[PDB]
Enzyme design. Structure first.
Site, mmCIF file in Angstrom:
data_model
loop_
_atom_site.group_PDB
_atom_site.id
_atom_site.type_symbol
_atom_site.label_atom_id
_atom_site.label_comp_id
_atom_site.label_asym_id
_atom_site.label_seq_id
_atom_site.Cartn_x
_atom_site.Cartn_y
_atom_site.Cartn_z
ATOM 1 N N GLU A 145 22.788 41.504 36.838
ATOM 2 C CA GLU A 145 22.869 39.593 36.561
ATOM 3 C C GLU A 145 23.547 39.259 37.192
ATOM 4 O O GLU A 145 22.791 37.962 37.589
ATOM 5 C CB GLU A 145 24.677 39.833 35.795
ATOM 6 C CG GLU A 145 25.008 38.091 34.979
ATOM 7 C CD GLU A 145 25.378 38.863 33.805
ATOM 8 O OE1 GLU A 145 25.994 40.220 32.823
ATOM 9 O OE2 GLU A 145 26.822 37.767 33.138
ATOM 10 N N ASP A 203 26.713 32.823 40.683
ATOM 11 C CA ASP A 203 27.275 32.621 39.202
ATOM 12 C C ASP A 203 28.617 32.002 39.881
ATOM 13 O O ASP A 203 29.709 33.340 39.451
ATOM 14 C CB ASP A 203 26.625 33.586 38.009
ATOM 15 C CG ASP A 203 27.499 32.730 37.074
ATOM 16 O OD1 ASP A 203 28.399 31.742 36.730
ATOM 17 O OD2 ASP A 203 27.668 34.168 35.360
ATOM 18 N N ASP A 252 21.027 35.993 37.526
ATOM 19 C CA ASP A 252 21.865 34.273 38.584
ATOM 20 C C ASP A 252 21.946 34.805 40.192
ATOM 21 O O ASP A 252 22.615 35.943 40.311
ATOM 22 C CB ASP A 252 22.931 33.551 37.784
ATOM 23 C CG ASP A 252 22.414 32.849 36.691
ATOM 24 O OD1 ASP A 252 21.616 32.041 36.837
ATOM 25 O OD2 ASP A 252 23.697 32.670 36.100
#
Lengths: 662, 662, 662
Positions: C355, C391, C388
């Site tokens: 992620e 982030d 991402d």
């Protein structure tokens, strides 16, 4: 020393009289439990002459001599360690119920001491390093300088050792470590050459290099540090330094290296030494952590060779303060990072360096490719390298011979166009006498870089369709040797490039030379004459505001660069109209004429005139001087003194009129 | 239970009858072979009570009791390793043969524990730390918390011992590890102070600084952290604190120092603590690797003082995370890193440093000078200091002049013009209530700085003939106290400089005041009314776009700073000939008039007129308004009501010539 | 099968003959003495089967068979100190006498060994990790692969250990280390998973990411490395995966993290482990310096779950080279670092983050805030993260229903307005398939970022009133079809932006999309028709020389982005005359009309004439066409076949005058 010659076959006698229990029975079971229970019975194994271990039923017999007898003859029974006993004689009585035989050892302190003290053999207690290695179980410890045997082998049984070094390894060869586990932590390593070799000191006491053979020779002294061995490059670039060196101080191979061939993840921590060197071979995930000033010798101070076998994923040089040496400081052979950019230097710093401070070997060694791909060279530093700067480039072979034996052939990736695809960032250089870089590749990107004062070229980038960002080449090539400050031989997009600094090129050599590359954001005072970029454009600047300090005018101008190098082309200066310390200024659109700059003018508000100063052709004008419809051009005729002005008809034709009449 | 009674002198017997061998023979040899031919033989020794091992004539003898006997008396034979036993009776028949046997002697356990264990000494069982250090050999541990009294010198000697500290050295005095051995390590020290001092907290509960002198006095709280004890400097940073500050808070000296003397390199990893200090008196090659927020006391947190003896090189502060303190953190003093920049601050983060971030000391501490040369201050951080984020200054003094004693005659190097050769890179500063950066020296190559939000002057560079780069000075003088966001006194040459961010302010004086430098590439927004450089000219860039977003007109707007630096000289800027999509926009070239911009101008394509627009003198023109040849000056004749043309004949004399007629 | 079965009970036989010592006697005395004296007799204890040591009288007895006896029963006789056995026969005679049975005094030697060795307990000796921890004082070592159950809660009792790991640490779920002392140094840990999960990899052999569901499903395989387990968010990156994913791999939650519960300063060190992960819960002042490619599982590799209780000051992630993962690789959950920016990320290196390479878990979890303030992200890098890059957002993207439960009320700080005061400098990303450098906050001063090639967006910034610097987003949005290279929705200010590299902005949308930003000097080859900022005022530039290298002219293509932000709004060209080198060129002030660039031009020196070609309206002039108070406008009159001048009086009365009668 630590083995007793004793009764090999045990003797089990009767408790109440001095006789052995014929047809006796022995049962072995779990500690502190009845062993008669077949479930409690633990394995009891024979040991025949072949080293086998075959289970046998539990009610082992005891013959009439006290020994234990199988269906045949005597046997050397074996259990694990924690065996209980239960003697039963034929009649059915009991003799013993030894609960835990391991509790009957003549000295049961060791059973407790062994479990609450850390294991570490000290080399002082042993005569040979290999013998100490063969005894270490947890971590070795060196407490005495070891005179290593010119390349002896030391195999640590594939164990995991937290070696700590508190003394040198005096010698002039290559101590070789082998078969270490995937946890080793050899730290505090120090290697000192047993031979003090002759060395040269090309620099002087003022940071100023010497490129003269006589001075180099006069700086030739005998000492382990503060210099390095003469090598091939030294008489490659220095003019004729073969002819000025005695044979004895020429082409020697004094060095001391700690080779760790064939190991995985041995994690060499702080290391030092004089004329030292650390040559990992066939390693993987084997990093070297910050080393405190290992003064190098004739071998790469940190060479991550991985020629034979697989590539070299995972070799790092994290941290470091390496110094001196006669060959590259940190090398890399093969060593493909295989995506992840797993490998390469980080936070490294290399003073001196008789070659590139962080070099990725080029060409091929033997018949094996020796280039480096998918590596990571970031947050590093180098200062005062002599022959080459932060030489990243691979396949930099000037000599073209043939296809690459071991990797992509030149038919698919032509030389100087390999997709080695490094990762680079936050670099630095200072005082490099060779070239600031040696990069060469296709389709890679670089980040913040700065090459401060140097005595050689600041960049030699033989790339192709790559991107360079925020490069800085301040005040480089102070020796005036070459004329290729920053040279790029391939299409590239340099942005935020920094050039001339406090030192002035003063028409020396040339600055950026990228006739096949496009550069933007060139900041700094560089004489524009010496720029040879294929394209250059500040496409994006907002509503600009030119300023002039210390001058009497604001020089906004164009300077077509193919028309004339030094000569400009057009300009819109705003010189003060008439002194008016705080009054006003005049604006003029000057344009260059016959090999001269700023001949014509369109002065506006000259001398507070508040009016234009339009020029006109001094004499008769032809019909080809207008290329745009509906345009008005004044041209003078002296004979009549009247100002004719030929006007291109908006209809498209041309007519000649009389504007001003006397 | 420590020892269990067991009979030595093992008994050997027969295999089928309980009789014991008589006058027999035991022969020992290699595994699984005939142990009778000297080819297979293995030496066997005698271990008498004294422990004096001795060899034996090979053929073992056994008396009539089945016990090994030598010279009549029973003896214990010990082999060197595993062996095969062949026991033959007096008759000569093989009583029994065995190929593999092993029983390590249980005796002599101390000899087998002196070797395979890691030596150390836990302080819990020693009265005085000196007593514990005396008995240590290659390690040591601080389990009990110590209570060193002021000045307690501890003698370690050449012992290269790893002092893994797991406790805290409580004491407001100083602990000295004198003449500790080379290559040592010290980890986990959590030094403390017995006396909690009266501190001040000049930063408000939310953020920002209390510049008021009467504001700090409120913070007076007497807590071991969250404040820096009052200092002499505090009496000039805050005007008027001499009075309100009670004498108890004056002249405090509550600090605890791990003074080290006469060592040639010792790591101080993870040197935590509070109200701490880590002076290194007269020390070389010692590096304070790493740290853990030691909330320092009144003395400098890390002070590599060396003015006692040699110049001192190799001292690092590599890594770390420091905070608080009254005097600067990580301050160097008389350390000449040499040519190789062996001493530096590579990696750091200082918070709320009482005086300065990395202040390198200045002038001469006592008779001996207190300056530095050839140090690298590479990537690091300094958060919310008070006076100096980085006081890398040398012979500053500001007021004191005379002559530096021990460095360089003022004749050879005037004030502030010292050759330092510091290499700097990747710096950072934030919220520095005082000068955020500053140094002096003749020739320095600075690099990326990226200063940011500050409550005081952005920088105070005092160098001479040095080059800076990527200097990012952003939102400084947030309190407006100082009139300069940067002041480069010397004839420096910046090579790319950012100035403003969001704290744009028209209440500040000249943002940059370098009166003799030569900057280039001032990218960020700024009010050009503020720049005071000697030559602002970044020459070299491509075709320009001069964009303007969401705004009527786009401009070039040349400005001459000799003329009303607040008012522009007027330049070329196109406007709009209607709403968007009109397709027409008139380029309106201008020129300033008496104290009014764009009063005189030349237009073109005025709202789609497709024609020029040429200004004329409203009154009569004069020769002064013209000088260049082959040009005419349209001036109006109100009397006759016609456009005359004051023409400068190419011949060099102007003839007033009429142009237009009604 | 290691030991040889052997009788442990000692059987005594006289020396010179094979007879047991019937009713003899044994005297146990002090070391090296004659035990017959009643004074040289140490206490001597029996040891029963159960382990109840009991004392008895000294002159031990021997039954008729040789074995020791007490009350007609056998016994094991032990002592607390090294002894000196003395055996006497019933008649009376010294059959044997051992000065030292063990050759050391363990009782006395136990003290010396206790106070001269480094305590530690290898796990091999202990069955349960909890038991080993209980029976340890420091220097605990793990030497066997302790396969912990799905859960394991270990209570260390507050001891300050030095745990180490030289062997794998296999298991599943999350092991739990609890009550570690302040200063532990867990190092070398190596975790694994007992289950091999089904993994996917959206990158081909060339790192060309995959986005079609069919391909990513086709590469689904079973292994621990080279991939990550699907996550609920994975159904968003690749549409349609919910339908095409087999049930077996649909949401498998596998991980082997070690949960360090409430602890202080347990500095974890080099860590590894396939599908391993790590995390700290309710823990302060702890860090995970360094790492060795810990491949993650369904949970963040280095999480900081410090949600319950007070905020988690000081939770650094220094160093490390983490790889892979399925939900994060450095996520923090709740960490207010104070004003000292304490507890950030330094020197990281992510890879293929499932992620994000670094996260801060914006939003809310349970009934508690999940943001985090005043952290410190520097010197990091994340390469090829999927969803991402860095982030760093704290406020939820679109969740106004809640009001930062337990955090600044939305009324206090609206959505995306939280003052975080993060410290972000010297970052980098590469290959990101999501957003490179996402962010949220107000009044923060990020700077010096070098975002790199990344299929996706260069950066999605939601900052308000923030200042940026040296940002370099280059050749991003490689896969195209994304919204914007960089999006800054707020009143931000940007400095030093680099934009477009060697890729073409053809199929991409506005490269810069900050509708209310004030960008400064934007540099690089960017199409000025793709920028959508609210300003580019870069006022502060100096004298410039806009020189073109390739083209045949040098241009200042002044633009207005309100008429039309594609074509132009007027230029200042200067084309060459008669080819390069002739020393002739004409300046061309121009404008735009009819939506065609260069419709009108007031060109000077065309064809090297030194003339002043001027454009004019090809028809009657209009008073509106003139606005300057004093200026004449030329206009053609085909009817009169002559030019006329629209003249405006200084007061403002329009006049008409003929220019050139024919």
């Amino acid at each position: 020393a630590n083995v007793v010659v004793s009764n090999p076959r045990p003797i089990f006698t009767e408790s109440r009289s001095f006789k052995a229990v014929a047809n006796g029975k022995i049962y072995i079971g779990q500690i502190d439990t009845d062993p008669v229970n077949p479930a409690n019975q633990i394995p009891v194994y024979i040991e025949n002459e072949d080293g086998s271990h075959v289970q046998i039923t539990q009610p082992l017999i005891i013959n009439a001599a006290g020994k234990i007898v199988y269906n045949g003859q005597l046997v050397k029974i074996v259990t694990v360690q924690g065996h209980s006993m239960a003697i039963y004689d034929a009649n059915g009585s009991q003799v013993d119920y030894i609960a835990n035989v391991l509790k009957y050892d003549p000295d049961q302190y060791s059973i407790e001491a062994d479990k609450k003290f850390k294991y570490s053999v000290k080399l002082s207690d042993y005569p040979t390093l290999q013998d100490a290695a063969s005894a270490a179980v947890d971590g070795l410890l060196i407490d005495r300088d070891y005179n290593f045997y010119g390349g002896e082998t030391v195999d640590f049984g594939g164990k995991v050792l937290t070696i700590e070094c508190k003394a040198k390894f005096i010698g002039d060869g290559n101590l070789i470590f082998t078969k270490l586990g995937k946890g080793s932590r050899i730290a505090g390593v120090f290697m000192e050459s047993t031979t003090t070799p002759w060395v040269i000191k090309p620099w002087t006491d003022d940071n100023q290099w010497l490129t003269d053979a006589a001075a180099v020779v006069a700086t030739l002294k005998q000492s382990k540090t503060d210099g390095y061995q003469p090598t091939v490059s030294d008489y490659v670039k220095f003019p004729g330094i073969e002819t000025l060196l005695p044979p004895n101080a020429k082409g020697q191979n004094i060095t001391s290296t700690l080779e760790i061939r064939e190991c995985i993840g041995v994690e060499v921590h702080r290391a030092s030494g004089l004329m030292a060197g650390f040559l990992f071979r066939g390693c993987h995930f084997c990093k070297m952590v910050d080393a405190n000033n290992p003064s190098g010798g004739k071998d790469g101070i940190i060479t991550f060779e991985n020629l034979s076998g697989d590539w070299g994923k995972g070799n790092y040089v994290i941290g470091g303060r390496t110094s001196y040496g006669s060959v590259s400081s940190a090398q890399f052979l093969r060593n493909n990072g295989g995506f992840e950019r797993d490998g390469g230097v980080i936070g490294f710093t290399s003073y001196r360096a008789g070659e590139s401070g962080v070099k990725t070997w080029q060409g091929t060694v033997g018949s094996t490719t020796s280039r480096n791909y998918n590596l990571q060279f970031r947050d590093s530093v180098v200062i005062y390298p002599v022959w080459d700067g932060f030489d990243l480039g691979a396949d930099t072979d000037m000599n073209p011979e043939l296809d690459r034996p071991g990797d992509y052939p030149i038919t698919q990736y032509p030389l100087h166009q390999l997709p080695l695809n490094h990762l680079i960032d936050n670099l630095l250089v200072r005082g490099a006498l060779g070239v600031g870089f040696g990069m060469d590749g296709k389709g890679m990107y670089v980040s913040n870089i700065t090459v401060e004062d140097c005595a050689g070229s600041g960049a030699y980038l033989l790339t192709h369709e790559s991107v360079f960002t925020n490069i800085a080449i301040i005040d480089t090539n102070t020796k005036d040797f070459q004329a290729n400050q920053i040279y790029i031989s391939g299409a590239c997009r340099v942005n935020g490039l920094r050039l001339i600094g406090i030192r002035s090129t003063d028409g020396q050599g040339l600055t950026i030379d990228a006739p096949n590359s496009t550069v933007s954001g060139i900041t700094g005072m560089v004489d524009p004459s010496r720029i040879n970029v294929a394209n250059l454009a500040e496409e994006g600047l907002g509503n600009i505001r030119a300023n002039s300090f210390g001058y009497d005018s604001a020089a906004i101008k164009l300077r077509i660069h193919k028309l004339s190098k030094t000569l400009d082309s057009g300009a819109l200066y705003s010189h003060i109209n008439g002194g008016a310390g705080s009054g006003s200024a005049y604006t003029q659109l000057t344009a260059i004429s016959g090999s001269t700059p700023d001949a014509v003018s369109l002065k506006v508000n000259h001398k507070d005139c508040r009016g234009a100063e339009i020029p006109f052709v001094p004499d008769i004008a032809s019909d080809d001087f207008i290329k745009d419809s509906s345009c008005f051009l004044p041209y003078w005729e002296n004979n009549s003194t009247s100002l004719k002005a030929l006007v291109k008809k908006p209809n498209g034709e041309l007519v000649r009129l009389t504007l001003a009449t006397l």
